[PDB]
DNA sequence: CCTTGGCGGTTAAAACGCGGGGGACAGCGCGTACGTGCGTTTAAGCGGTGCTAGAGCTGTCTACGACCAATTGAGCGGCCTCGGCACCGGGATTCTGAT
DNA sequence: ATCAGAATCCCGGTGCCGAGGCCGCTCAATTGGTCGTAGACAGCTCTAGCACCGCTTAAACGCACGTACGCGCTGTCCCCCGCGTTTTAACCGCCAAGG
């Protein structure tokens, strides 16, 4: 694909496709497909980053969903980003309230 | 032996906030959705993806709605939730008018 | 019989360039594919609202670049405008 | 059923809530909360389904109806 | 000139501002300060009046309905007065930090 | 200047009472000033940046409406 | 009769309907008679509006319709506010909500 | 040039309505918008399940569907109920 | 072939009973700021008023994008034998409670 | 302080099942060339907006009077859990099989 000689991992093909196949407008730049792969492969990059070490962190090399979902609730412009929007096989990172406690 | 009240509830929490494991069964959850979706129309197939994305989204809303009840509760130097702390809980985000 | 397209190979290959020694799951490659198109879903609509609202019919980077800032945070959203500017000058001045 | 759900899964469901200890009229609360929950995705689920004029509730279906409310359910074919 | 105990004329005031629709902020108070919050981002700016009384009209009512969930936490607690920590329990829950 | 805490106390009053308040105490108009503050601060950040798309330095009444309406915060009666 | 609205009962113009559904990047291709069953759709709605709106007019011995009166309509009704949850309406307020620790006993 | 309204449109719902009843151009805007919006949001629905289905194209009973997934119970039911006469006074003349 | 149906059965998930003793809760005391009035200060409401800015609208030149026509190689469909953690055996160290 | 009663995590052995390595593929991305319509350079404009400026009586800041609600204190009521003991079932472990 173009990707190789933009520099980019993902395929900007791929996303200029999936710009067609939506009728979102007649027309669309050439830029807009390039850069909206980066950034698409910028975020990825960014959470994967994030995902590797968490699977570290736990003597680990594999990710599952859990790893994923730690990633994302542990940054906050990214837990912003998935604010109300639900992940399979998720759940919710470990919060004890202190009144609960025993004294 | 009888361990002082509340350790044994905040250990669960702990172990449970953890784990991966399903909290509801797949069986009464299936057979309620169901019987659910059986009001409209019956023999209604569900694939077993179908089961588990409600399930997943019914507890982790569900969840999320008992921390809210939690936080309200707390709010009130109280631990025990109450039907008024669940009516807080759902009045405070818009979903009850 | 319909071949369909996702992002397994290419998360992988990122994951590799940040994290040669790391694996993942069969289900966490589906969970990337319906969080990235969820993303390019938000980012194509509020593309199209930008080029309706603006009353224009060709959405160009610009479009997409002022999307971003809405999207994500004013940091990382200025990350991910840097980024895409460095790509799309490296395709306008590349064949 | 509505009814089939046993105390300690409310029970653990608070543990993973982050309630320490829930009333008796919790349980039924609750029970009534699942309940419509479950109706609310339901019917925009099985709506879905049924434009499609298909018998088995497609797993996609959920992402199309929670998509309605804003609650998007990742890893469905989204 | 006499006093009552209070309650009473609150309740009046409560009323009255319930009652009517007129925005019961002062204009240009509000307006500068949209002004002093738009400056800090780009400069140079100017602000057509539809716009500002349209920012005006939301902050006023989504600041009421906050309030109304406040008092609904106030009430939550055994209590009638509002106090901020009823605030930090309704934005958390809504999802607004 | 200092317009952030030139909002009058009686106005923040009138907000409160509105809410159905009737015992306001004296740090809920500094917390509502201090909400506000970040309210006002996404909303206008907002309509600048779809201002700025268009080469535009003058915020119309049609970006804030857009920006509220991809919110959600649609505001009737003011165009959009 | 000339316009399609007459055709079908209603008054709601088809072309501009049909016209925002082409030059709105929405589908490749849009129905014909589609547009007729959405607007009759949307004028069910405005009549269903407009008749407790106008009572809400007309109990306050104010014929002239005012925005207060279409805010009090429209968060009203069950129906109408759950619609309109998270919408406002210009120059509208908001409900009269009074508890009972608020009043004094 | 020629912004399309809906200012004789909603004089005529009126009339049909509240004959007797004045209305502001405040309430005017309000109605507007009203319109605009719920017409913008079964558009989208439409757009997306058309798009779910595999089609170009938008039937009748995709907006019917739309009309009952968006619209309140009650409300969706009635507004079905009143399209489908149409539809028929339609497509009979 | 992805879904449905049936048939048996068992330790993990859970159900009745004793008793709790800290958690939930009613009531009583106490302090200070919030309700309520007015005295007095205030820059805001309203009206002029002068200027003018940049965006709405339009003449006009048009560049790269949808598409026709054609083309090719890599990500996905499908295989396959091996490895990072599933899963348990059995062990040391930190809590939690009673003293 | 000072003790145990069991709780839960780590190392190592077993091993296994899918995660990737890898081959065939076919269609989706690339792209030579062609014509076009909102895109855009540039200009006309023109009034709602920017900004200042003055006058005035309604709203706000200050502040006293006082007392009632939030917080604290004292005491009281009792209840899902902790466990003991018992309960029965969701999914494993199997098949057919059909729409």
């Given at each position: 694909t173009?990707?190789?000689?933009?520099?980019?991992?993902?395929?900007?093909?791929?996303?200029?496709?999936?710009?067609?196949?939506?009728?979102?407008?007649?027309?669309?730049?050439?830029?807009?497909?390039?850069?909206?792969?980066?950034?698409?492969?910028?975020?990825?990059?960014?959470?994967?980053?994030?995902?590797?070490?968490?699977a570290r962190d736990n003597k680990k090399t594999r990710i599952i969903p859990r790893h994923?979902?730690?990633?994302?609730?542990?940054?906050?412009?990214?837990?912003?980003?998935?604010?109300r929007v639900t992940i399979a096989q998720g759940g919710v990172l470990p919060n004890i309230q202190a009144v609960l406690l025993p004294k | 032996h009888r361990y002082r009240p509340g350790t044994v509830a905040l250990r669960e929490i702990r172990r449970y906030q953890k784990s991966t494991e399903l909290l509801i069964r797949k069986l009464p959850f299936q057979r309620l959705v169901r019987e659910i979706a059986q009001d409209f129309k019956t023999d209604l197939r569900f694939q077993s993806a179908?089961?588990?994305?409600?399930?997943?989204?019914?507890?982790?809303?569900?969840?999320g709605?008992?921390?809210?009840?939690?936080?309200?509760?707390?709010?009130?130097?109280?631990?025990?939730?109450?039907?008024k702390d669940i009516q807080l809980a759902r009045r405070i985000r818009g979903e009850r008018a | 019989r319909s071949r369909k397209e996702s992002y397994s190979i290419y998360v992988?290959?990122?994951?590799?360039?940040?994290?040669?020694?790391?694996?993942?799951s069969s289900k966490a490659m589906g969970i990337m594919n319906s969080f990235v198109n969820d993303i390019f879903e938000r980012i194509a609509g509020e593309a199209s609202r930008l080029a309706h609202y603006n009353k224009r019919s060709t959405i160009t980077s610009r479009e997409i670049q002022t999307a971003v800032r809405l999207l994500l945070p004013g940091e990382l959203a200025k990350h991910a405008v840097s980024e895409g500017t460095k790509a799309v000058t490296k395709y306008t001045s590349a064949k | 059923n509505i009814?089939?759900?046993?105390?300690?899964?409310?029970?653990?469901?608070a543990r993973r809530g982050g309630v320490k200890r829930i009333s008796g009229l919790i349980y039924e609360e609750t029970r009534g909360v699942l309940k419509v929950f479950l109706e609310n995705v339901i019917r925009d689920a099985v709506t879905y389904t049924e434009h499609a004029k298909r018998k088995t509730v497609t797993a996609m279906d959920v992402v199309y109806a929670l998509k309605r409310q804003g609650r998007t359910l990742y890893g469905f074919g989204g």
């Open positions: 173009r990707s190789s000689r933009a520099g980019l991992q993902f395929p900007v093909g791929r996303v200029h496709r999936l710009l067609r196949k939506g009728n979102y407008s007649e027309r669309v730049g050439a830029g807009a497909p390039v850069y909206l792969a980066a950034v698409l492969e910028y975020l990825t990059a960014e959470i994967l980053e994030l995902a590797g070490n968490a994923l979902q730690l990633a994302i609730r542990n940054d906050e412009e990214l837990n912003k980003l998935l604010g | 179908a089961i588990g994305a409600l399930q997943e989204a019914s507890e982790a809303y569900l969840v709605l008992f921390e809210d009840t939690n936080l309200c509760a707390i709010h009130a130097k109280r631990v025990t939730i109450m039907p | 992988y290959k990122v994951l590799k360039q940040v994290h040669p020694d790391t694996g993942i | 009814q089939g759900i046993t105390k300690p899964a409310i029970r653990r469901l």
